[PDB]
Amino acid sequence: ASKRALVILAKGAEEMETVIPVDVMRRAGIKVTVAGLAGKDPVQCSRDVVICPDASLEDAKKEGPYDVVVLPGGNLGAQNLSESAAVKEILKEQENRKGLIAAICAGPTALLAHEIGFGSKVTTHPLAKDKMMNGGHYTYSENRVEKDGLILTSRGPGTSFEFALAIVEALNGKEVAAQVKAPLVLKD
Amino acid sequence: ASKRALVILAKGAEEMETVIPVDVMRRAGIKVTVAGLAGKDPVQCSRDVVICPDASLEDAKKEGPYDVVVLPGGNLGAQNLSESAAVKEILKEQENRKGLIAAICAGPTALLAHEIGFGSKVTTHPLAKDKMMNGGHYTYSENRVEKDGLILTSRGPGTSFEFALAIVEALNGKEVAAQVKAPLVLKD
């Protein structure tokens, strides 16, 4: 009866956008797996923070399904996610079974690369808007967090807390999100 | 002409309170060293995020001095910082040379353990107030970020961004802090 979250960690990922959702989700009792795209080895993030993943993506793929798949941002991290066939397979499967997909900052551009959720309203970091909108396959929003159907997107590192709490609310409900929020000393 | 920051990482540290200041400070061009209290080995943080430090505290001690020493929170992390004689030596030295000392959430309780900055106005996480105020050696504040002399304190994970930008403003000035802040998509 425990919800499961998959966080895909690639080199160049934004470490703040990785750690905040992982931390907040585990505070909410969600079983989170931080999966390294390239394997089990430590991952150097965009600002040189080095994080040890819980498993390789290959091994984590076999222990599905996951109630949410989380794509952190970071320009180079998002590019590596966009180029990975393994990510394409995971996202298409998640879309077919109507599971939640969450991406923040530059992360949403991986959805375009893999043709995920066309027709949805999405947001990105302002610097990633043009890339996300190439072809007009999505409708753009400037909301700090945007949720359309099974696609949940957010804008940047400064929205990571709201991004993470939105995932918790979608999975465990509004009361759990509120209980997890209070000890964090968030402003609003 | 480059400022240097020391971040002391112990088991049980709050990983959000560690990664956000490290990330933000490196965005500001500060040379940050994440030093493992127990050595070079990977550190399991409070919510099971595993971070590889840049160096052992022993080795980082020899490459001082640092313009700021940063103590993350996390109840068990702060306890390990409070029990470490090496931390006591680093903090007393930093106080004598009038360098900046920054601690967030439960981190400030290490200042009491090591008799640092008595008489200063400080803040902590609400759950750490009673511990910090044992003896009445500080004056308590409920501000999200508090700076009194060379002691800079903050309340919790949700204040980490303001905590980090305050460090940047103290070291590199208000203009650099504002430039670093804008791409983060912070609310206020």
Curated annotation (Swiss-Prot), chains A, B:
Q: What is its EC number?
A: 3.1.2.-, 3.5.1.-, 3.5.1.124
Where is this protein localized, as stated in its record? Cell membrane; Cytoplasm; Nucleus; Membrane raft
PTM per Swiss-Prot/TrEMBL = Sumoylated on Lys-129 by PIAS2 or PIAS4; which is enhanced after ultraviolet irradiation and essential for cell-growth promoting activity and transforming activity. Cys-105 is easily oxidized to sulfinic acid.
Q: In which tissues is it expressed?
A: Highly expressed in pancreas, kidney, skeletal muscle, liver, testis and heart. Detected at slightly lower levels in placenta and brain (at protein level). Detected in astrocytes, Sertoli cells, spermatogonia, spermatids and spermatozoa. Expressed by pancreatic islets at higher levels than surrounding exocrine tissues.
What's its top-level EC category?
hydrolase
Q: What is the effect of changing C52S?
A: No effect on mitochondrial translocation neither on deglycase activity
Outcome of mutating L9P, per the record? In PARK7; uncertain significance
Which GO BP terms sit in this record? adult locomotory behavior; androgen receptor signaling pathway; autophagy; cellular detoxification of aldehyde; cellular detoxification of methylglyoxal; cellular response to glyoxal; cellular response to hydrogen peroxide; cellular response to oxidative stress
Q: Which residues carry this modification: N-acetylalanine?
A: A1
Q: Where is the active site?
A: C105 (nucleophile), H125
**Assembly with partners or alone:** Homodimer. Binds EFCAB6/DJBP and PIAS2. Part of a ternary complex containing PARK7, EFCAB6/DJBP and AR. Interacts (via N-terminus) with OTUD7B. Interacts with BBS1, HIPK1, CLCF1 and MTERF. Forms a complex with PINK1 and PRKN. Interacts (via C-terminus) with NCF1; the interaction is enhanced by LPS and modulates NCF1 phosphorylation and membrane translocation. Interacts with NENF.
Name of the molecule in the record:
Parkinson disease protein 7
Q: Which species is the source of this protein?
A: Homo sapiens (Human)
